[PDB]
Design a protein around this ligand. Structure first.
Ligand code: SF4
Ligand code: SF4
Lengths: 176, 100, 364, 144, 70, 318, 156
């Protein structure tokens, strides 16, 4: 159940004493550490050549939010506001009105990427798979305002990344 | 004159670099950036001095080895070294070597 | 307050990372409150998630499914490996080793890849939730964990080669930060801090929480209560975590990964899209959340940095009334002053390292 | 000896990149002189290579095109230049290249991928997407 | 890999090699194709001065052999 | 042409220092499973140029406001002495041939501490002054052993003339004769150059930047150049003292190659040590010298005095 | 003009020097420091790019605000920024540093580090993956490459 680290008594025989005196005087353990570092020097480095080489990611990766569409092209989101409710950082602001066609659509869908925590909620809550955190992670901006996304920005992201997003959802939709 | 030349050249080169590094980059336009306990362990420094004295006394030894009275030379050299060791041992045992 | 290089008085000022977590939790539902615990201890996120999950489950009188429990113990030990790697390697970096940092951080990257495969986040995932685990392991992950674990022993051995018997490393830690067992108990220390002093207490054995009763491992115990003994304990605990990981890999059960109760765990996507009951429960769970029966509980786990506890009180609503987080680093940083007496600055750095303090935990 | 083999492999690397000029080109652009099987090339010009012998994380790499979306990218390259279809293959999200498994074709999907446009006239500017809520009274134009 | 370290080491090696070769060849050039005479004791400097007087061009490295005799 | 020789000694040493920086970076990276700077130029050869230019173009902060004369002299003295100490070294023919070049180098090394001493004081800060004091103690503490070990080994040379070391080690390296002294001398070089595990002076992990915390842009660059030049020079002194090289009088190139390679090996050993071990505690550093090394050096000095007499191997004075 | 050509080449040189040798300071408050270290870790090693962590603010060129910036920590952050010599660039890592993130409504959290110090590059994420941080750093390098200090000086 329990193991004693340390709690060992060195031997007092002349051979062991000579060995320990040799270690102290001849710096044996230091040489062992040096040899370890040398071996690591001759080992192949683990660096990947970013940006030309990219780190592995799984289909469930949580990145830039992206509003998706149906195959017909109609926007999937149906103004349920379920995402705004689950949002743990209140980064989602949704406003809706009956559109001219009479469908329930969002007049405003703002995701403040400066307040969002990339929790993965909403993606798992939206009943119609509308907001889906895309695979993109390299969307840094030079100004704070660029990170306050708008419904137009989210829909453009969805249109841009739909080819990858549909494949990732297809990969993972059975696990969900 | 060779050693004097070397000294001059080195000092001038280093000072030239200090000039090109204290004034030349100081031109670049910018703006405003605003902006002891009594060490009793200094005894170690003082002991270094008295040991550096023995260091000086011991430097002639390579030429001292060339004498004909090698017996006397060896006895006196070991005498000085043993006195230095005795001084170190005394300071050690009297906790005088209280480093830091 | 330093006389020469000796610390006469060490006074820790904290709150530089106080983010009012406990206040914010009161305004969130339990599911919304879960992500904070990932942030609380950035090095050991899933362990904090598990502690919160145990608290909410116990208040809920609901039991996680066995496969969820085994996934939880497996990733808890993976998290412990990550946390110990960070603690031991950063302590070494602070005292100047610097190379084991990179050596073991490569393994940390691989374990982050495991996190990413399960949850999609390299760290601060929401994998462990009240009622079980959010999603089942993606196919092929367990064997990859096997591949990683079968070689991790050589890496930790190499770390020992660099540090364990080094004269300089021993001199920096052999007798610094000595804590008496009674003093350690009184000052509220937990985990290695207690076990380094020689007291035999591991919550995983004494009060097992999920499936640790069904796994075999040895609690490393120290003899002199110093930084070096804590280092030895941390390294051994890593080895025992590798053993536990092997056991969990071999005997993972088949079945559900979340409680088969749609009033607590959300229904499956197909079911919520095809059945009215499932959709109703999904709507209420992701909008209002699950009401917890009124009550209070203190649930503690052997987190990698010590005992991590959540004092959760519920008013019967969908948002907790009060949530108090017991961070093991809080008491250790409190006792830092006692440990530092009679030591020099560098020894203070070493002591700070030995008390594995993550100031997200301390400040909350 | 194996050392002679390694030197000859270096010479093969020099030859495979199109000669000394191509070797220097790839060395200065990408800092890597490995030669790998060319899986495919996107419309923008990025070339994608695979060498399964190299350890995981270096088995797949991309040589960014010198010109994309009216920008000279000979020296300035960025990760966003990767089109979404090849993004998943590059980041190991899938083992099947887009040439082998084409993405599903949809009308709304963009036909030309745009890189990160921050610091450019194309940069996104946030704005409200809702109309005015309160309508003010319009005074009459007649004097009385 | 680890061979990538070698080019910097080679540049450093050439930079360190430059001064020694430079000193040797400068001594050879100044002392008429022979090593600069080392005078650690006054006798050797006296020999150098005598050679300077004997040379007739006030350069010690110029060596007069049996031909000057008789 | 003597000025030409001075420049030939000076400029290549500075270039070697610049590229030693890159070499250090790459070696430390590879021993940490990383790759050194390689983006900036082919295999990172242009990184030192970028570093230097960035440093020089950087803001010249100076809140010293005390004895600015000293705050400027310290970098000058450091760089000048680092360049000067290279002069007496025989590679294989020294630039300046001194009967007592060894004691000259010892004196120059002792003087070079004043650069750290003044810089830290004229900075007039907290870490700077205390760190400078710790420096004085460190260099002063190991200067003693450095001298004793040097005297002990030269007892076989028969003079303080560096050039005769080549003759003495013509048949065998002096490391075979005095390896315990060699180990202690190597550790001593490490301490004198303020390198890990004795990098207490700068001591970034403990002291934000040490004596150079208030030095930026060019003066910091001069301190860096002086530090690395001292590293190379001390390793060269080790190579000449113990790892002797064959010298063909007609072809000095062979000796120059051998010497350069040995110095490179020793510098790579310095970087290797910096990577492997953690830093000795200030107190432990002094404990290792005055209490542990100083004794053994005294005993070995007695032995190296006695051995030539009892073995009739007194070296020739000339 | 020839003068414009010389000025442009010199500005290219200085911008290349500054972007190639970017020395971020060892400043990490919260979780994002872990991903920053993982950037420093061997897989995405920043030293290849010339990015080297130097503790001294006076010897540093970029400040990475990796973590939640609390009201108690804010004056110290401003002080360390001010003591940093110029040219100086600030990279905000994490939703917490960008805009407050999870703790935006906390009484003890500064809602974004832009309020305290100017920010050049914002790295989204919570935590931003080390690859995202490396991308942000390279974007900062491109931003330096686009700078036209000497050109503007010559145009006056
Ligand atoms: S991922 Fe971000 S936007 Fe989505 S629910 Fe979580 S906090 Fe809100
Ligand atoms: S953004 Fe996320 S990871 Fe970064 S400090 Fe805030 S909570 Fe931690």
């Amino acid at each position: 159940t329990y193991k004693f680290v340390n709690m060992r008594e060195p031997s007092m025989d002349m051979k062991s004493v000579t060995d320990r005196a040799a270690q102290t005087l001849l710096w044996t353990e230091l040489v062992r550490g040096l040899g370890m570092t040398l071996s690591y020097l001759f080992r192949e480095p683990a660096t990947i050549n970013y940006p030309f080489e990219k780190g592995p990611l799984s289909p469930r990766f949580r990145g830039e939010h992206a509003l998706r569409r149906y195959p017909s092209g109609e926007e999937r989101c149906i103004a349920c506001k379920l995402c705004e409710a689950v949002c743990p950082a209140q980064a989602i602001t949704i406003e809706a009105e009956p559109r001219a066609d009479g469908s329930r659509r969002t007049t405003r869908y703002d995701i403040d990427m400066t307040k969002c925590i990339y929790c993965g909620f909403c993606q798992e809550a939206c009943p119609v798979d509308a907001i889906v955190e895309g695979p993109n992670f390299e969307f840094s901006t030079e100004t704070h305002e660029e990170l306050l996304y708008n419904k137009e920005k989210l829909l453009n992201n969805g249109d841009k990344w739909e080819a990858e997003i549909a494949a990732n959802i297809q990969a993972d939709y059975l696990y969900r | 004159m060779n050693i004097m030349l070397t000294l001059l050249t080195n000092v001038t080169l280093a000072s030239l670099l200090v000039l090109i590094a204290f004034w030349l980059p100081q031109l670049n336009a910018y703006s405003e950036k605003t902006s002891p306990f009594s060490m009793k362990f200094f005894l170690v420094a003082i002991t270094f001095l008295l040991f550096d004295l023995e260091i000086a006394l011991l430097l002639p030894l390579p030429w001292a080895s060339q004498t004909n009275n090698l017996k006397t030379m060896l006895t006196m050299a070991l005498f000085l070294l043993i006195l230095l060791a005795a001084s170190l041992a005394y300071e050690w045992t009297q906790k005088g070597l209280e480093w830091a | 307050e330093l006389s020469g290089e000796m610390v006469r008085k060490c006074d820790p000022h904290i709150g530089l990372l106080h983010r009012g977590t406990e206040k914010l939790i009161e305004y969130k539902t339990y599911l919304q409150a879960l992500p904070y615990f990932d942030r609380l201890d950035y090095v050991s996120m899933m362990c904090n998630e598990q502690a919160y999950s145990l608290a909410v489950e116990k208040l809920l009188n609901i039991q996680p499914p066995p496969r969820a429990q085994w996934i939880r113990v497996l990733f808890g030990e993976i998290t412990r490996l990550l946390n110990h790697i960070m603690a031991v390697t950063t302590h070494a970096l602070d005292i100047g080793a610097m190379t084991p940092f990179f050596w073991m951080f490569e393994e940390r990257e691989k374990m982050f890849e495991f996190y990413e495969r399960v949850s999609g986040a390299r760290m601060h995932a929401a994998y462990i939730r009240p009622g079980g685990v959010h999603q089942d392991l993606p196919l092929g992950l367990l064997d990859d964990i096997y591949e990683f674990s079968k070689n991790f022993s050589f890496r930790i051995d190499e770390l020992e080669e660099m540090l364990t018997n080094n004269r300089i490393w021993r001199n920096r830690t052999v007798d610094i930060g000595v804590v008496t067992a009674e003093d350690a108990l009184n000052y509220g220390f937990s985990g290695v801090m207690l076990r380094g002093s020689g007291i035999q207490w591991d919550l995983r054995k004494t009060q097992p929480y999920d499936v640790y009763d069904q796994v075999e491992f040895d609690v490393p115990i120290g003899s002199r209560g110093d930084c070096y003994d804590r280092y030895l304990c941390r390294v051994e605990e890593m080895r025992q975590s590798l053993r536990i990981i092997s056991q969990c890999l071999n005997k993972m059960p088949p079945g559900e990964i979340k409680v088969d109760d749609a009033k607590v765990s959300p229904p499956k996507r197909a079911e919520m899209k095809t059945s009215m009951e499932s959709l109703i429960h999904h709507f209420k769970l992701y909008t209002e959340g699950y009401q917890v029966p009124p009550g209070a509980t203190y649930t503690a786990i052997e987190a990698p940095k010590g005992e991590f506890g959540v004092y959760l009180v519920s008013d019967g609503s969908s948002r907790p009334y009060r949530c108090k987080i017991k961070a093991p680093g809080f008491a250790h940083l409190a006792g830092l002053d006692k440990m530092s007496k009679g030591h020099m600055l560098a020894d203070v750095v070493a002591i700070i390292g030995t008390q594995d303090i993550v100031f997200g935990e301390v400040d909350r | 000896m194996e050392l002679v083999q390694v030197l000859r492999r270096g010479l093969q690397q020099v030859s495979g990149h199109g000669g000394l000029r191509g070797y220097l080109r790839v060395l200065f652009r990408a800092n890597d002189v490995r030669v790998g099987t060319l899986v495919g090339e996107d419309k923008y010009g990025n070339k994608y290579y695979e060498d399964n012998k190299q350890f995981f994380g270096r088995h797949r790499w991309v040589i960014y095109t010198t010109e994309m979306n009216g920008r000279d990218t000979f020296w300035d390259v960025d990760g966003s230049m990767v089109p979404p279809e090849w993004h998943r293959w590059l980041h190991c999200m899938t083992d099947d290249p887009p040439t082998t498994k084409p993405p599903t074709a949809r009308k709304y999907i963009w036909t030309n991928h745009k890189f990160n446009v921050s610091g450019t006239p194309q940069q996104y500017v946030p704005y409200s997407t809702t109309r005015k809520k309160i309508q003010e009274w319009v005074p009459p134009s007649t004097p009385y | 890999m680890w061979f990538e370290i070698l080019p910097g080491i080679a540049v450093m090696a050439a930079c360190l090699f430059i001064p020694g070769m430079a000193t040797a060849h400068i001594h050879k050039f100044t002392n008429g194709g022979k090593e600069k005479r080392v005078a650690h004791f006054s006798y050797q400097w006296n020999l150098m001065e005598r050679d300077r007087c004997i040379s007739g061009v006030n350069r010690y490295h110029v060596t007069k052999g049996l031909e000057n005799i008789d | 042409m003597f000025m030409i020789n001075i420049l030939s000694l000076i400029i290549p040493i500075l270039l070697a220092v610049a590229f030693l920086t890159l070499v250090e970076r790459k070696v430390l990276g590879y021993m940490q499973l990383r790759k050194g700077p390689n983006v900036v130029g082919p295999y990172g050869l242009l990184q030192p140029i970028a570093d230097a230019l960035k440093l020089f173009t950087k803001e010249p902060l100076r809140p010293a406001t005390s004895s600015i004369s000293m705050f400027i002299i310290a970098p000058i003295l450091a760089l000048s002495l680092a360049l000067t100490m290279w002069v007496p070294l025989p590679m294989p023919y020294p630039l300046i041939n001194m009967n007592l070049g060894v004691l000259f180098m010892l004196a120059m090394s002792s003087l070079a501490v004043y650069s750290i001493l003044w810089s830290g004081w004229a900075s007039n800060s907290k870490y700077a002054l205390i760190g400078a004091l710790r420096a004085v103690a460190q260099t002063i503490s190991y200067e003693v052993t450095l001298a004793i070990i040097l005297l002990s080994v030269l007892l076989m040379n028969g003079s303080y003339t560096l050039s005769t070391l080549i003759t003495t080690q013509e048949h065998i390296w002096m490391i075979f004769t005095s390896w315990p002294l060699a180990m202690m001398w190597f550790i001593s070089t490490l301490a004198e150059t303020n390198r890990a595990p004795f990098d207490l002076t700068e001591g970034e992990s403990e002291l934000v930047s040490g004596f150079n915390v208030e030095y930026a842009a060019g003066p910091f660059a001069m301190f860096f150049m002086a530090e690395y030049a001292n590293i190379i020079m001390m390793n060269a002194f080790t190579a000449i003292l113990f790892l002797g090289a064959s010298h063909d009088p007609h072809t000095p190139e062979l000796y120059t190659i051998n010497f350069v390679l040995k110095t490179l090996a020793l510098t790579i050993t310095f970087l290797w040590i910096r990577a492997s071990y953690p830093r000795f505690r200030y107190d432990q550093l002094m404990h290792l010298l005055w209490k542990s090394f100083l004794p053994l050096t005294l005993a070995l000095c007695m032995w190296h005095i006695s051995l030539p007499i009892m073995t009739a191997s007194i070296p020739p004075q000339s | 003009s020839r003068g414009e050509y010389v000025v442009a080449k010199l500005d290219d040189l200085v911008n290349w020097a500054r972007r190639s040798s970017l020395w971020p300071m060892t400043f990490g408050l919260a979780c994002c420091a872990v991903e920053m270290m993982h950037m420093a870790a061997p897989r995405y090693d920043m030293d290849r790019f010339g990015v080297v962590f130097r503790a001294s603010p006076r010897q540093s060129d970029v400040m990475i605000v990796a973590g939640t910036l609390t009201n108690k920590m804010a004056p110290a952050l401003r002080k360390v920024y001010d003591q940093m010599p110029e040219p100086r660039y600030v990279v905000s890592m994490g939703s917490c540093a960008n805009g407050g993130g999870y703790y935006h409504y906390s009484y003890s959290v500064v809602r974004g580090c832009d309020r305290i110090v100017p920010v050049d590059i914002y790295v989204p994420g919570c935590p931003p993956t080390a690859e995202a941080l490396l991308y942000g750093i390279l974007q900062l390098q491109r931003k330096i490459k686009r700078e036209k200090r000497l050109r503007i000086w010559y145009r006056r």
